[PDB]
């Protein structure tokens, strides 16, 4: 499933037009990206959580930030 | 940021009403969950990819499926 297909699925099940579904899909992902940028954690009931972890400085290799996702029980169970 | 706050952010930036933004947010996450359930991979340009990995059977511990996320370059760079 790619982005175009996700937008089509969102449009079809929500009743929004494809133009509005597009706006909403972009806003979801842009919002999550902005929250992480600020160093906040995005906690979504049922789905999972997004957070940023810092990878430690070492061996003359600087520290860096890594976006990460932890699946929630609901997603873990649906996939099993 | 929790789900309610994500919905508010989506409503505010997309121009949709909070009721429609709710529908769209749920559809995004339900769609991604359904795609994984089917064993498909969700590839979203800029953000990242979701996929299911099988954890191997071993030591009289059965195999199991794990939902996973790989961040895309765009998200990696925005967060750094």
Could you describe the largest sheet of chain A, including whether it forms a barrel?
Answer: 3 strands, antiparallel
**SS-based class of chain A:** alpha+beta
What form of chain A results from the Cα inertia axes?
elongated
- The CATH superfamily of chain A appears as IHF-like DNA-binding proteins
- Which oligomeric form is depicted? homodimer
Helix-strand topology string of chain A: HHEEEH
What is the radius of gyration of chain A?
A: 16 Å
Largest interface: A-B, 48 and 48 residues
What is the CATH domain class of chain A? Few Secondary Structures
What order do the strands of the largest sheet of chain A run in, or round the barrel if closed?
1-2-3
How many domains of chain A? The number is 1
Count every helix of chain A, treating DSSP H or I runs of 4 or more residues as helices. 3
Output the CATH topology of chain A. Answer: HU Protein, Chain A
Helix content of chain A: 40-55%
Question: Total number of β-strand segments of chain A?
Answer: 3
Beta-strand fraction estimate of chain A: 15-25%
CATH architectural label of chain A: Irregular
**What is the straight-line distance between the termini of chain A?**
19 Å
Walk me through this protein's architecture.
- Chain A has 80 residues and is α+β, with helices and mostly antiparallel strands.
- The first copy, chain A, has a single domain (1-80), classed as IHF-like DNA-binding proteins (HU Protein, Chain A, Irregular).
- Chain A has three helices and three strands, in the order ααβββα.
- The first copy, chain A, has helices spanning 3-14, 18-37, 73-79, and strands at 42-44, 48-55, 64-71.
- A three-stranded antiparallel β-sheet of chain A has the order 1-2-3.
- In chain A, helix 1 crosses helix 2.
- The longest helix of chain A has 20 residues, at 18-37.
- Chain A is elongated.
- The two termini of chain A are 19 Å apart.
- Chains A and B meet through helix 1, helix 2, strand 1, strand 3 and helix 3 of A and helix 1, helix 2, strand 1, strand 3 and helix 3 of B.
């Amino acid at each position: 499933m790619n982005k175009t297909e996700l937008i089509n699925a969102v449009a079809e099940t929500s009743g929004l037009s494809k133009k509005d579904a597009t706006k909403a899909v972009d806003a979801v992902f842009d919002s999550i990206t902005e929250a992480l940028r600020k160093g906040d954690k995005v906690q979504l009931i049922g789905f999972g959580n997004f957070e940023v972890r810092e990878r430690a400085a070492r061996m003359e290799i600087p520290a860096s930030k890594v976006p990460a996702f932890k699946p929630g029980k609901a997603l873990k169970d649906a996939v099993k």
